[PDB]
Amino acid sequence: EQYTAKYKGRTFRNEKELRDFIEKFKGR
């Protein structure tokens, strides 16, 4: 059970995903 980081109603359990999410949904 890795970290449960949540951003847009989606917990992140993989650095590959988070490194691609915040990088894509940076907020514009």
Strand partners, 5: 12
Cα→Cα distances 19→4, 10, 27, 28, Å? 14, 14, 15, 17
The experimental technique used to determine this model is NMR
For the CA atoms of 25, 16, 1, 22, the dihedral, rounded to the nearest 10 degrees, stands at -20
Q: What are phi and psi of 6, to 5 degrees?
A: -115, 140
Quick one: which of 7, 3, 5, 4 has its CA closest to 26?
Answer: 7
What are the residues facing 6 on neighbouring strands? 11
Spatial distance between the Cα atoms of 16 and 27, rounded to a whole number of angstroms: 19
Query: Is-contact 15 28, C-beta < 8 A?
Result: no
List helix spans (H) across the chain.
15-24
The DSSP symbol for 12 reads E
